[PDB]
Amino acid sequence: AKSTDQTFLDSICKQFEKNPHLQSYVVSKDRSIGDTCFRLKHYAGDVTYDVRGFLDKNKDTLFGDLISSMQSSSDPLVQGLFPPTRPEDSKKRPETAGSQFRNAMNALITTLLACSPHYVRCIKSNDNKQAGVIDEDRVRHQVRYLGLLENVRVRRAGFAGRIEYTRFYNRYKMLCKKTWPSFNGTAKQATELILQQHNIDKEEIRMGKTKVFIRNPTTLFYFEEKRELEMP
Amino acid sequence: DEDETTALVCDNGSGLVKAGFAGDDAPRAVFPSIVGRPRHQGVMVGMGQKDSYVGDEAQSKRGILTLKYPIEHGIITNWDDMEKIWHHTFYNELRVAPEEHPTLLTEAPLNPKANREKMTQIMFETFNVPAMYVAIQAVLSLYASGRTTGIVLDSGDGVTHNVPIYEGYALPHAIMRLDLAGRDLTDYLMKILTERGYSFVTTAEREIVRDIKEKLCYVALDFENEMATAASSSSLEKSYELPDGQVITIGNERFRCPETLFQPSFIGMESAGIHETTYNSIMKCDIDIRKDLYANNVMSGGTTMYPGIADRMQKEITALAPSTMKIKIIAPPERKYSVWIGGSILASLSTFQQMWITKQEYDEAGPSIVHRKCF
Amino acid sequence: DEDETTALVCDNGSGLVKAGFAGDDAPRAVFPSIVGRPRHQGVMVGMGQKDSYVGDEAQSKRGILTLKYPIEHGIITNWDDMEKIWHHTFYNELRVAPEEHPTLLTEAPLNPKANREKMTQIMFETFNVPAMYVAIQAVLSLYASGRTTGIVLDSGDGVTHNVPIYEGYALPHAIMRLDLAGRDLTDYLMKILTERGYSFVTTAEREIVRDIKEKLCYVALDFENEMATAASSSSLEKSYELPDGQVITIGNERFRCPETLFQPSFIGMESAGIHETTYNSIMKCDIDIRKDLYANNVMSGGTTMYPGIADRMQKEITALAPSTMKIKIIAPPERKYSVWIGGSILASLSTFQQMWITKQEYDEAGPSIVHRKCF
């Protein structure tokens, strides 16, 4: 209780300042950090927080020694403030904050690892409600701290030109032979049967989930063109 | 409860067994740490007596019971009976298996070394406890009241302990232990009661002495001025109808016994008063560290609940203590559960991990694991 | 601040760490050059003690601290603790990065050669200082008071130095060093205090001796005439209520200890008084250069603040010194910060460029760069 927010800061430095993603003005020599502030890394940048508040801002817990006297009244307003005891959220009522916050965040996770979810992202254009104006510095930043283009390369693997098998198959059908309903089944042996009849190195292409992997850009311009000087 | 897993809080003394569920602010099922058999041979057939009569069931019917207390401040007269006290705690009231949730017990400062290893034997080897610690009485309450810089004197019925803890524990001695509390006041009454045609003879009814004590008995501000007041039968005698039926007009009996607190010379002990021992602990620390100690004094325990307990201290202290700065004593209006409120603190801390004893830790360092890591 | 760039002033001793911002006339955040740990083991958990307790935070609470001073006049008992003294200076109070602004430190005259290279190692290699110099204590104050032709005797708690600087430094020796100031007077009191039922035992409270000293203690004009005056309890004893609460009627205690200053024979040292050593330095210079030295005498330092310090000098000097011309001693009513006022001077000079050490200069002449260019 007596420990203030200032003292709490020192309790972090000693315990860490070695585990990645945490710095301060003491260890990291950076004037940007105040004598009453600290550094903390997130995704792709740096954020220095203040200490004002914290205490009364966090705990906020409320015990049943202040509620009992009030819910003992007889008025649809007074007792009304406290609906028919426990609206599907109780189990155990008196718990010193900390844990109480964990519940709001744990109840969120427990119901995510047992369902089939769907994802949707959004990007705000500008700070003027304009449907045709770009704020260079602001836009590029929005695309970066979300880590979307890294989710593009890494997910696949990490290179240049990439195409889906499921979509590569039903697209490049009328090019090579033995790629007809009389196919074998595998997406590897079939492709080998395709690229071997037209003299193409096999290591240049590799098979995984649903993405073709040919390193370096030049090969793309090499493939596309080759499909033009011998078949309009 | 879809929150965490394995957690609980407990605390025992020479009065009540304070305990509750996981992550609680106040206890839930406190009960007297008693236990006896049958001096009446319990209708031998209207059950094979056994169960000494511990818990509410025991406190309810005292007559049949020969209340023989196990742990008198420090010394444990017998450990064999302790077996079926904790068997009543975790399983009946707490309704939880000790082979799951940790346990936070209290430590009577300066307790025999042989006792710690004996206790651990009862938990780890029998009740299988993979995590537990036995914190030191006073230091706990310090973090509850919201004090970091004060002197604590936590004591109720167990043993008096002057713990100057405001910036460090386990260092110079500056601590004292005195077997003069609770049961000492409970046994002394029957003696002086003899002069008033009253005598709570056996131990069973002796326990009641404490019950009535904590509802009227007060401390005299000055025995001299209240000696002449005795003539005025108004502030002294008060009709107290004994539940059964035998009025006891306690008056001068109220402020005569408590006087022993400040004057241990009434029971053949050279032990100095609680305000002298306070000096003994302060004079050891540095010279430039007293002005802040007097500013705030942590007086805790159920013993600091009687009328005229804090005001008297401010009269005797100032005399043999520096007289320049202001002196204030912080005695929480409910300073008995100060240890439990502090217990709830350490019970929710994770740093506490570097204190308790893990199942394997015991087997890796033998039985001395306790006094090898702890202190 | 849209003026210049990279500038600061500093000064340390055996009392306070005088420092400020860029281009200042007076210091801004002075603090005691102390540092200790915990003889109390700081509630080990109510923080992993560490931080020895340096700075205002240390001076505030002395009790928990075992104030073990690092730099006793010349000798540095340990350099490892110095690491976290300057880490508190530039970063906490000064609020500036040492990897930007220069630094002007002071040099204890005739300091071990091995020390200079060690210090530079802490700045250049660790704290990265591309420009700094360590000027020589006394010479600084000379240009502040507005004197070009005088003899300086600058000393406070560190070491006594007779620096005859009125037309040249670093030349014949004519200088002396005496480890008899400040802490010497701070440790000697507890000894003689024993005869008056007082004893500031440990080092923590020893620091307070200095606090009370600089508010009452004075020097006797003539011990003989003031010996009979002792009977007259009026000019001697004076009620001083110790902040905590313990009156100390200092009287003969005031002018007994300071007598050691002029009489180093009370602590087993053949070192002659500060007025004899003055002769030793004057007799070395030419014969036709004394008449102007006596005209003006620069007495600086916090040691020259006590009552009866300048008038006594004019009594002893005239005796074993030429008696024809007039003799006047210039003792600036506030002659303690004389070094800092002079520090502000050299801090704003550009000629100073041909003195300090540039980042590259260290790597081009190895670690001996200091004693290769400076002197």
Ligand SMILES: Nc1ncnc2c1ncn2[C@@H]1O[C@H](COP(=O)(O)OP(=O)(O)O)[C@@H](O)[C@H]1O
């Ligand atoms: N308000 C009160 N007034 C007087 N005695 C009280 C009060 N509250 C509790 N007590 C008594 O204090 C004792 C328990 O104090 P405690 O400090 O917990 O003891 P211990 O730690 O020795 O077990 C019991 O004898 C109880 O009856």
Ligand SMILES: Nc1ncnc2c1ncn2[C@@H]1O[C@H](COP(=O)(O)OP(=O)(O)O)[C@@H](O)[C@H]1O
């Ligand atoms: N007015 C004063 N009267 C007496 N002592 C003083 C006065 N002002 C400063 N001092 C003392 O002088 C000492 C600092 O003097 P200083 O010359 O700066 O020492 P150093 O150079 O050895 O660090 C401190 O002990 C301080 O308390």
Ligand SMILES: [Ca+2]
């Ligand atoms: Ca106890």
Ligand SMILES: [Ca+2]
């Ligand atoms: Ca100095």
